[PDB]
Coordinates of C-alpha atoms in Angstrom, one line a residue:
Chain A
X1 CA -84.9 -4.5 22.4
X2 CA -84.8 -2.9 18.8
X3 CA -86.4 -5.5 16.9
X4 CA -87.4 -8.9 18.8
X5 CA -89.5 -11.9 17.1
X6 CA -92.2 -12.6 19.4
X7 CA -94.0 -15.6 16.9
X8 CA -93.1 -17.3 14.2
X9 CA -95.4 -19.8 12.4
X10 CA -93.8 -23.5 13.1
X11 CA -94.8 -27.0 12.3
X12 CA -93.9 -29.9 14.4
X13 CA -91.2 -31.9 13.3
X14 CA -92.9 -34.1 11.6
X15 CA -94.5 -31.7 9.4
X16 CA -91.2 -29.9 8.7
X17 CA -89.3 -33.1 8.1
X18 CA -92.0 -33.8 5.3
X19 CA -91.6 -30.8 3.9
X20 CA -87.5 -30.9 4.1
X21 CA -88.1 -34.5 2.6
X22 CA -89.6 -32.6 -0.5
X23 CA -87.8 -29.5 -0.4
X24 CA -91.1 -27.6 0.0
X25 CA -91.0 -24.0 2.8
X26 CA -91.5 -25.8 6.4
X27 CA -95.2 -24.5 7.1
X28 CA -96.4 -26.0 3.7
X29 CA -98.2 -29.6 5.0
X30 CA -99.7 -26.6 7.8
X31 CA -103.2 -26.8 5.8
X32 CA -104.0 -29.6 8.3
X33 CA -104.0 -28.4 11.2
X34 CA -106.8 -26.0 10.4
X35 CA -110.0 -26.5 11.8
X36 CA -112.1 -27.3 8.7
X37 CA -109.4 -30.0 7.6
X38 CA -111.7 -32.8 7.0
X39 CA -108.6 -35.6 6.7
X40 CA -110.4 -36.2 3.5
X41 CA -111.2 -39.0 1.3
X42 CA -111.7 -38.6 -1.8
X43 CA -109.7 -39.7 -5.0
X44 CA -108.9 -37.4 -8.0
X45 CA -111.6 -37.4 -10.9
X46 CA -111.9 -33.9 -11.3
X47 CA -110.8 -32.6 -14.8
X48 CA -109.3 -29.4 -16.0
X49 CA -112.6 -27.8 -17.6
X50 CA -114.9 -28.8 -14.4
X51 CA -112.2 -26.9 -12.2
X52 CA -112.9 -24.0 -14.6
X53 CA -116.4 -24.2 -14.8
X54 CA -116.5 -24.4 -10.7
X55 CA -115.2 -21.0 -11.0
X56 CA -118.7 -19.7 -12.3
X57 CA -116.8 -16.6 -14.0
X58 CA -116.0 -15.5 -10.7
X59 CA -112.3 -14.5 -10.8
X60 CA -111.5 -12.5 -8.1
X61 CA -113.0 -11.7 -4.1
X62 CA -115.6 -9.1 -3.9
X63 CA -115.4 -9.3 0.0
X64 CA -118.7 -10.5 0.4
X65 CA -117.1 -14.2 0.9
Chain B
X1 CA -91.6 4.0 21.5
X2 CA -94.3 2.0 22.7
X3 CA -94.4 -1.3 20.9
X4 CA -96.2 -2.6 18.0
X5 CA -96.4 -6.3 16.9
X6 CA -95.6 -6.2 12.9
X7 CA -96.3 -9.6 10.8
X8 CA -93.8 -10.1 8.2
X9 CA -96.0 -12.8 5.6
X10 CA -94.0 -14.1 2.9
X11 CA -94.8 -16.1 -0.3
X12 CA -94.1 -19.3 0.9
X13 CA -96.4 -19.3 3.5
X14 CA -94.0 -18.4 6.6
X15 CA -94.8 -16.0 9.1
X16 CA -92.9 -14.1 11.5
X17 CA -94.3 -11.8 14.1
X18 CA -91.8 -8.6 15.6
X19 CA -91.9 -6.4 18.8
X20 CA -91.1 -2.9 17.1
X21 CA -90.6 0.5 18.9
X22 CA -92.8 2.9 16.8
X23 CA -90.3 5.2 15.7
X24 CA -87.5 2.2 14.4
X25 CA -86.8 2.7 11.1
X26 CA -87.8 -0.8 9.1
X27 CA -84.5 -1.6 8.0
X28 CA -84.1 -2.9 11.5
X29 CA -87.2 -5.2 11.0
X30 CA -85.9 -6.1 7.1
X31 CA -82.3 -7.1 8.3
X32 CA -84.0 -9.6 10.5
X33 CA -86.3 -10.6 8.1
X34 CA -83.7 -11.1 6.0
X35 CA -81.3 -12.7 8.3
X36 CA -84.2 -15.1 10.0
X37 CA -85.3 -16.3 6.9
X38 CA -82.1 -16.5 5.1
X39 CA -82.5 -14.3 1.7
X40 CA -80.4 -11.0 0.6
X41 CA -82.6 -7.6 1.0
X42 CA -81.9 -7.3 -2.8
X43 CA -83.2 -10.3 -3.8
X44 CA -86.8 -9.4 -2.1
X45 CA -88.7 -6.6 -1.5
X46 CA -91.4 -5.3 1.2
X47 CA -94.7 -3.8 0.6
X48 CA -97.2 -2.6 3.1
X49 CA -100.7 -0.8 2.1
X50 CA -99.8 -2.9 -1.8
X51 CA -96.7 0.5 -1.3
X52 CA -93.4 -1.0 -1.4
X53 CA -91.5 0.5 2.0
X54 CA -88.0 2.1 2.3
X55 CA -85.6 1.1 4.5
X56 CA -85.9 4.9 6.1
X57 CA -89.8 4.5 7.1
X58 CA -90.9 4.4 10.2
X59 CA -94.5 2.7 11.2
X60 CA -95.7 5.8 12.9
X61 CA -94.4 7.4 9.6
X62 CA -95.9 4.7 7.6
X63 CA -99.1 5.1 10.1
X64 CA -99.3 1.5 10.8
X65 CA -101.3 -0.6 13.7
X66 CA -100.9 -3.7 15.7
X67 CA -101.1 -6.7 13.8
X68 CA -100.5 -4.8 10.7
X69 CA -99.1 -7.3 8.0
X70 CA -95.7 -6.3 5.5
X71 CA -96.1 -8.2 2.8
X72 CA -92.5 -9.6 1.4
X73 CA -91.9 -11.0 -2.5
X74 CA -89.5 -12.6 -4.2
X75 CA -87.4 -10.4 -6.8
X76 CA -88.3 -11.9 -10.2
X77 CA -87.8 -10.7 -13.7
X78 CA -89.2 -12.0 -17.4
X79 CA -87.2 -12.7 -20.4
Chain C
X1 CA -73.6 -29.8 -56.8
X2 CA -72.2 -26.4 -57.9
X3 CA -74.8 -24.7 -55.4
X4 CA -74.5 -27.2 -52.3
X5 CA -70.7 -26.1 -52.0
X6 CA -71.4 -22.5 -52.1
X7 CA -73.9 -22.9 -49.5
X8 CA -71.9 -25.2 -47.1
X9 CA -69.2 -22.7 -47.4
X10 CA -70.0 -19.1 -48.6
X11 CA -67.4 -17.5 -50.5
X12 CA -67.4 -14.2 -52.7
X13 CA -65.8 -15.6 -55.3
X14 CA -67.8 -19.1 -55.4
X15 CA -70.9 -17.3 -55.8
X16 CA -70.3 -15.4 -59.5
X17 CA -68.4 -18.7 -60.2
X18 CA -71.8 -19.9 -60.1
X19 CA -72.6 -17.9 -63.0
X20 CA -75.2 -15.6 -64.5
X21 CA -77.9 -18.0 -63.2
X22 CA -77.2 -17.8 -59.8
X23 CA -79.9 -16.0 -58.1
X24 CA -82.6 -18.8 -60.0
X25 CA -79.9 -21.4 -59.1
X26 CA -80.1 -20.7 -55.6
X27 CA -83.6 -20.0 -55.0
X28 CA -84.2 -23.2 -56.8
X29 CA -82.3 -25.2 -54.4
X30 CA -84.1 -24.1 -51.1
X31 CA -87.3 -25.0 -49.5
X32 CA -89.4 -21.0 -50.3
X33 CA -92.0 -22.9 -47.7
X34 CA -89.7 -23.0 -44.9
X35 CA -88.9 -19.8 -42.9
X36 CA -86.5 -21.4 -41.0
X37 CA -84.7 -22.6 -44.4
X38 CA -84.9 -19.2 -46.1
X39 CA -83.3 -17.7 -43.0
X40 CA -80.2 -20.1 -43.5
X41 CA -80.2 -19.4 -47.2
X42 CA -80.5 -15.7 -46.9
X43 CA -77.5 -15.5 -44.8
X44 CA -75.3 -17.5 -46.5
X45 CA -75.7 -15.3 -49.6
X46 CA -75.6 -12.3 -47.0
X47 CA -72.4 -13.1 -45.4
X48 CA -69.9 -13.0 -48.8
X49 CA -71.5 -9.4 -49.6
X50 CA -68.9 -6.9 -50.8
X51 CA -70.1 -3.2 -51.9
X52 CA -68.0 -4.4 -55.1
X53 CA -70.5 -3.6 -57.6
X54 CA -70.0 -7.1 -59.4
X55 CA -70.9 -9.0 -55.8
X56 CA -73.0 -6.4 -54.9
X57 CA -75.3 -6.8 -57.6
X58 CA -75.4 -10.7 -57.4
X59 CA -76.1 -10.7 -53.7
X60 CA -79.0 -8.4 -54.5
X61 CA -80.4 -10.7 -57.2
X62 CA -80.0 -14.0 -55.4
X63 CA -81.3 -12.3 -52.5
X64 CA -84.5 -11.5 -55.0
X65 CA -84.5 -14.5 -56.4
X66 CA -85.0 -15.8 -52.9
X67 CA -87.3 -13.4 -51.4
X68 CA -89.9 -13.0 -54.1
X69 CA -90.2 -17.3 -54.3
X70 CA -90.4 -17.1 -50.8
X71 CA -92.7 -14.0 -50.0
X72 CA -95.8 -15.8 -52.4
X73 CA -94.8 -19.0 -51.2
X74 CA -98.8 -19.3 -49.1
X75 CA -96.8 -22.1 -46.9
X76 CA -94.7 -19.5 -46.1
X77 CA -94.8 -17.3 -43.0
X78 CA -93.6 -14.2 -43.0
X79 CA -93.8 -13.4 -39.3
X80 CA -91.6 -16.5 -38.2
X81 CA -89.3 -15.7 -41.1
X82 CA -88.5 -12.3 -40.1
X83 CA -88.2 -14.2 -36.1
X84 CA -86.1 -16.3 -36.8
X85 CA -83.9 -13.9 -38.6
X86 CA -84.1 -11.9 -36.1
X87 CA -82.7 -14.8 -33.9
X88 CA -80.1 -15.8 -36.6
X89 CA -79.1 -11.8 -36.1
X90 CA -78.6 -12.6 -32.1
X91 CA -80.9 -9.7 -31.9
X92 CA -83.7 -11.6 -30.2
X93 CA -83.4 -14.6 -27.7
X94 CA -84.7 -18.1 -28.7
X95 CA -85.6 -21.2 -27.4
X96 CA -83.2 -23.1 -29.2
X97 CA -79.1 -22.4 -29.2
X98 CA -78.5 -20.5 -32.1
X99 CA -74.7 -20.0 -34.0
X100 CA -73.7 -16.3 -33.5
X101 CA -73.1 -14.8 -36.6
X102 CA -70.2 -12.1 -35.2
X103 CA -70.8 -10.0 -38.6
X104 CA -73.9 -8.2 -39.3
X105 CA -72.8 -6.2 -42.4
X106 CA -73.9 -8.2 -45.6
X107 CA -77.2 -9.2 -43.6
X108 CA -77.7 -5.7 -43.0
X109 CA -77.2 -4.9 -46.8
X110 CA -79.1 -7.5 -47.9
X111 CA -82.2 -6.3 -45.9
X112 CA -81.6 -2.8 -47.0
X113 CA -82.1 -3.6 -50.7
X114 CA -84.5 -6.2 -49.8
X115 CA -86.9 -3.5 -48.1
X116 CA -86.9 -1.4 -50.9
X117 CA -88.6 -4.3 -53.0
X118 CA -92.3 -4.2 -54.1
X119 CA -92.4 -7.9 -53.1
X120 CA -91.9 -7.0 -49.1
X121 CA -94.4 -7.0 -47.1
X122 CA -94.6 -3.6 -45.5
X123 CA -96.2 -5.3 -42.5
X124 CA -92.7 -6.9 -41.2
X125 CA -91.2 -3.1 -41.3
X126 CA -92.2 -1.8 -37.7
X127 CA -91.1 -5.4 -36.2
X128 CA -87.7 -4.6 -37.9
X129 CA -87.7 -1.3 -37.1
X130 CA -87.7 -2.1 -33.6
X131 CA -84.9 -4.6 -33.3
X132 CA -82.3 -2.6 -35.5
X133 CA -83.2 0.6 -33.3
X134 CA -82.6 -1.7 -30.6
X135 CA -79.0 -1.8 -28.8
X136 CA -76.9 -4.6 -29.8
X137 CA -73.0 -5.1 -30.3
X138 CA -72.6 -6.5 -33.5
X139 CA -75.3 -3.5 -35.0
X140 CA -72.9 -1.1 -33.5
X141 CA -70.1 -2.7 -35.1
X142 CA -71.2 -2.0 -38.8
X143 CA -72.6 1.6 -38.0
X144 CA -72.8 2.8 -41.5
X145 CA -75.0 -0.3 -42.5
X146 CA -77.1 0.0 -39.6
X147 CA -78.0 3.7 -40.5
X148 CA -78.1 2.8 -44.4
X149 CA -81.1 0.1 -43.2
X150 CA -83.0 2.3 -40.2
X151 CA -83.3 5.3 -43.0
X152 CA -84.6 3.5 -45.5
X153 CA -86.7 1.8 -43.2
X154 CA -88.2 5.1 -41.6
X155 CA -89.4 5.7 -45.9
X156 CA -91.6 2.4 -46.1
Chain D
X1 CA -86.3 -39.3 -7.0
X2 CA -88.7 -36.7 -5.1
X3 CA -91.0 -35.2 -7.9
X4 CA -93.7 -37.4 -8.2
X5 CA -94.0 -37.8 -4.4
X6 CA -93.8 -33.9 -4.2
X7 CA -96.4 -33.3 -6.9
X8 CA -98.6 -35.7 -5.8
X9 CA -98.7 -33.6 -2.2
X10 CA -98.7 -30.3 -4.1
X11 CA -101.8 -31.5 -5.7
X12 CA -103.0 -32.5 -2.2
X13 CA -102.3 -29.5 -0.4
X14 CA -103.5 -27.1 -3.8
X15 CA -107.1 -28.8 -3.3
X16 CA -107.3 -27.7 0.6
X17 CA -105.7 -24.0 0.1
X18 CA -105.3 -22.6 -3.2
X19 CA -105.2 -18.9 -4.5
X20 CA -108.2 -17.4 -5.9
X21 CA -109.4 -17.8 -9.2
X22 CA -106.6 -19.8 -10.4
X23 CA -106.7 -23.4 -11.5
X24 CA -103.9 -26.2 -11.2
X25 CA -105.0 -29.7 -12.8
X26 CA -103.0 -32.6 -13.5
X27 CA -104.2 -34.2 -17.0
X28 CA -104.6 -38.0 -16.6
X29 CA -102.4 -41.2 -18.1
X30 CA -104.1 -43.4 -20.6
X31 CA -104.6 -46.1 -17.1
X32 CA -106.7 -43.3 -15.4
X33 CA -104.3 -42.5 -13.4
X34 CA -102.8 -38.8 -12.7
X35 CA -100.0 -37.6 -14.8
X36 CA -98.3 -35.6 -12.0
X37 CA -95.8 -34.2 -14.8
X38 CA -98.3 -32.5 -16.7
X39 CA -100.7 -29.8 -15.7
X40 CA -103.4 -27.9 -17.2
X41 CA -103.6 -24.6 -15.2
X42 CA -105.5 -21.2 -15.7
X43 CA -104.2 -17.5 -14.1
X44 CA -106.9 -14.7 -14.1
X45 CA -105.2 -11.1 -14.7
X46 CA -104.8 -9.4 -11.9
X47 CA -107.7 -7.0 -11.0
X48 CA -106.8 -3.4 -12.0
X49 CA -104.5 -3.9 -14.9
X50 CA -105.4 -4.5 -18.5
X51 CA -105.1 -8.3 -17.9
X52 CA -108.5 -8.0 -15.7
X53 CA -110.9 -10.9 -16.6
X54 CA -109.1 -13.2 -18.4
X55 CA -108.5 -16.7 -17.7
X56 CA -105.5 -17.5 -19.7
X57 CA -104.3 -21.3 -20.2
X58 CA -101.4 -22.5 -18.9
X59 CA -99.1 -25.8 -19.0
X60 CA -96.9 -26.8 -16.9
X61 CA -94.7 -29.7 -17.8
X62 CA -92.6 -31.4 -14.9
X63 CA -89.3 -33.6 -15.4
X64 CA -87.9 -36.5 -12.6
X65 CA -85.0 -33.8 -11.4
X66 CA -88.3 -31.4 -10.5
X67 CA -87.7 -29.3 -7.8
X68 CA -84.0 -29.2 -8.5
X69 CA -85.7 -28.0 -12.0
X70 CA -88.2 -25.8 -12.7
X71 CA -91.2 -27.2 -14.8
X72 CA -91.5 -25.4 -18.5
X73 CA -94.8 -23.3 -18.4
X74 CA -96.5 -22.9 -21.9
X75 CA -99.3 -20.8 -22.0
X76 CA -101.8 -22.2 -24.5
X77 CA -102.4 -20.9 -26.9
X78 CA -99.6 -18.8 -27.1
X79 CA -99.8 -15.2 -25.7
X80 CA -99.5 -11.5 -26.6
X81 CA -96.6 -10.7 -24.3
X82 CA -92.5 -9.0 -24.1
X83 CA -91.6 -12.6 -22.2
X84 CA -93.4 -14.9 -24.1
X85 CA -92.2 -16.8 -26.9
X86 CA -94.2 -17.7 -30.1
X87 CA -94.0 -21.3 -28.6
X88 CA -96.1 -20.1 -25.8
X89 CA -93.0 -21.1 -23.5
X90 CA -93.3 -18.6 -20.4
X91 CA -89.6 -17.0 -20.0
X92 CA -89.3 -15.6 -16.4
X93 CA -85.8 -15.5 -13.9
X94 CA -87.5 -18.3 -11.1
X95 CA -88.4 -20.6 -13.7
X96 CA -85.0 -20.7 -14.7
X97 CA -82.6 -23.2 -12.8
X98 CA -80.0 -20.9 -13.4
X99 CA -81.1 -17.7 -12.1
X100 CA -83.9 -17.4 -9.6
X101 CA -85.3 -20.4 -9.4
X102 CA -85.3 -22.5 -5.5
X103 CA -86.8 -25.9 -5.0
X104 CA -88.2 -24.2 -2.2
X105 CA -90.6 -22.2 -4.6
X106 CA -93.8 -23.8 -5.3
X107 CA -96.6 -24.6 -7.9
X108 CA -98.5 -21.8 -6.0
X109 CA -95.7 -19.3 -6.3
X110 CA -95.1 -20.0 -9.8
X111 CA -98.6 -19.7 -10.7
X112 CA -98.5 -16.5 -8.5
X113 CA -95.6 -15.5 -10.1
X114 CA -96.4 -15.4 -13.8
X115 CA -99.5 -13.4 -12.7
X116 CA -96.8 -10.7 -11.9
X117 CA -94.9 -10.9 -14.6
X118 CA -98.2 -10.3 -17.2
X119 CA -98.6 -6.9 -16.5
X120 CA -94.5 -6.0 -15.2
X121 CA -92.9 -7.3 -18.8
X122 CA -89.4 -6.7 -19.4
X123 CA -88.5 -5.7 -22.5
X124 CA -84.7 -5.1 -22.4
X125 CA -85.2 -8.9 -23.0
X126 CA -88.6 -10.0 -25.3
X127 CA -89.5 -13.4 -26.1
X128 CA -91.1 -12.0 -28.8
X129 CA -90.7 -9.5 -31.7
X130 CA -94.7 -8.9 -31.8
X131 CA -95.7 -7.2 -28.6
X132 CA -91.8 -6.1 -28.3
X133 CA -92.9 -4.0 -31.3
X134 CA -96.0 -2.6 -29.9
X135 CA -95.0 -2.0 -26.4
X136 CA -92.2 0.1 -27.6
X137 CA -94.3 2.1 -30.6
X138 CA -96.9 3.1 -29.0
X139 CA -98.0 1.8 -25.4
X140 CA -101.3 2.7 -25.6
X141 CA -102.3 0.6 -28.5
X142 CA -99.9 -2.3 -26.2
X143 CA -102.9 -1.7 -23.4
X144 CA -105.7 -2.1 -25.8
X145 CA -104.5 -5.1 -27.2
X146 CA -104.3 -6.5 -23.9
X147 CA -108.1 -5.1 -22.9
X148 CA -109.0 -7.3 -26.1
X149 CA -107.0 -10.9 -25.1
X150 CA -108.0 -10.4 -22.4
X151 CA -111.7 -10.0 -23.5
X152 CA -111.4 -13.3 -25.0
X153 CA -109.9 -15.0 -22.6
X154 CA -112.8 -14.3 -20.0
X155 CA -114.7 -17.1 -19.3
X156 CA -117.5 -19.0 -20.0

């Protein structure tokens, strides 16, 4: 009656036994189930100092995102 | 005294949602934070509004809302 | 050689035994380009000081003799020197595991005399300054030598 | 026998839903292929602090026992900090095996992590005799030589 927890953010138990496989916090693989998730393709070219050009000089949120 | 849903949002991702009378001091909330998640209340520390809360606050006291998030961290130190 | 068993094992007694030519003998026989080298050197000759006038005075010169190759050395850095002392000291942490040296008393008469010297860079001061103002065990073991080095320290 | 398998989903999950303005890379073997081990990654000072605009380097080497062990993080080049060695080797309690560090704590949280710890040094315990030095003299000439790495350090 105090305190009670209502939610808690949970994977199923195949996410969370992926995660427990690697050690990694239980909602990690939980990037999946949102809705722009694209199950993507693509391999890993992308080097170091295209990353940081990709940033534009824009280091922080402005709000305007 | 009515009730307010608090989310607790830690580091790792997690995120665990309480039912909260008003006028409860937090200490309540951080023991079962704590407990829940499994840490020591020493070896993290909460922060709403980017201040870090005392175990005496109270969300009416600390003017809080529904939905409001606490922000937890992981104690850390350089050296 | 006379120097190489001095140095392996640092005795009062084997270092006037070395003779007159002592300070040049020993300053010969290290690498002035290493920091790291100079350190090791340096305390060696540190750790058999007495305030024995006739040790005194030939930890001072060797110390000189040492310093002064070292200091113009342009291979040697002066910054990293005074680190890595400062690490030999256990005043600062390192990366490596160091050997704790559980007397500080030559070392901190050593760099007393050695501070007064026109060939010291006066740039390395504040960085010592900090780290002998800093608490530590074996700094408040040898007070008096502590003191001795922070006043003459607070004249450069 | 978990690290490349975890890194390699780290690395997966970091290209989806990754903090803002940071940058985690994995170089490449001489095949083409990822090194999983070794990352090039970049932390922006946080906004407000004297660390505000720059993008400071960072390396983070892995090991086969990773996440039993922490990776070693190396900011490159080396930076004017209390906690960082002359090395450039980051020195902070959850990248330390012994102390604070869980194989529950991520890439993410280490990257978040030493973006705390550049403006909340501890200097009961420096890395470094340098900024040690300056923090402690005077900490408002710490803060403008912060203001200028950081100056430096912002992109383009």
């Amino acid at each position: 009656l105090d305190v009670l927890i209502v939610y808690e953010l949970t994977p199923t138990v195949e996410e969370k036994a992926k995660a427990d496989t690697l050690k990694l916090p239980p909602t990690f693989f939980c990037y999946k189930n949102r809705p722009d998730y694209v199950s993507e393709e693509e391999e890993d070219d992308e080097d170091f100092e295209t990353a940081v050009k990709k940033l534009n000089g824009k280091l922080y949120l402005d709000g305007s995102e | 005294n009515d009730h307010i849903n608090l989310k607790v949002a830690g580091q790792d991702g997690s995120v665990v949602q309480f039912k909260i009378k008003r006028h409860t001091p937090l200490s309540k909330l951080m023991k079962a934070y704590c407990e829940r998640q499994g840490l020591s209340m020493r070896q993290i520390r909460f922060r709403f509004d980017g201040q870090p809360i005392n175990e005496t606050d109270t969300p009416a006291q600390l003017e809080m809302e529904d939905e409001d998030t606490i922000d937890v961290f992981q104690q850390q130190t350089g050296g | 050689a006379d120097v190489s068993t001095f140095l392996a094992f640092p005795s009062p007694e084997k270092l006037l035994r070395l003779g007159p030519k002592s300070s040049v003998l020993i300053a010969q026989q290290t690498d002035t380009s290493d920091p790291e080298k100079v350190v090791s050197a340096f305390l060696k000759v540190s750790s058999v000081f007495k305030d024995e006038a006739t040790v005194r005075m030939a930890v001072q010169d060797a110390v000189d003799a040492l310093m002064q190759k070292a200091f113009n050395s342009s291979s040697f850095n002066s910054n990293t020197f005074l680190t890595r002392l400062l690490v030999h000291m256990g005043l600062l942490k390192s990366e490596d595991k160091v050997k704790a040296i559980a007397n500080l008393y030559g070392p901190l008469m050593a760099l007393n005399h050695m501070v007064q010297q026109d060939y010291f860079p006066k740039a390395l001061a504040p960085l010592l300054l900090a780290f002998v103002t800093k608490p530590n065990s074996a700094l408040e073991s040898c007070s008096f030598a502590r003191h001795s080095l922070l006043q003459t320290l607070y004249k450069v | 026998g978990i690290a490349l398998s975890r890194l390699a989903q780290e690395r997966k999950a970091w290209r989806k839903d990754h903090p803002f303005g940071f940058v985690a890379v994995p170089t490449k073997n001489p095949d083409g292929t990822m090194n999983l081990m070794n990352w090039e990654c970049a932390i922006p000072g946080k906004k407000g602090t004297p660390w505000e605009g720059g993008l400071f380097k960072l390396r983070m080497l892995f090991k086969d026992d990773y996440p039993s062990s922490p990776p070693k993080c190396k900011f490159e080049p080396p930076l004017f900090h209390p906690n960082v060695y002359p090395s450039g080797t980051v020195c902070l309690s959850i990248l330390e095996e012994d102390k604070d560090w869980r194989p529950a704590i991520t890439i993410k949280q280490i990257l978040l992590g030493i973006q705390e710890l550049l403006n909340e040094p501890n200097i009961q315990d420096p890395a470094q005799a340098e900024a040690y030095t300056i923090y402690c003299q005077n900490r408002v000439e710490y803060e403008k030589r912060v203001r200028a790495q950081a100056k430096k350090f912002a992109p383009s």
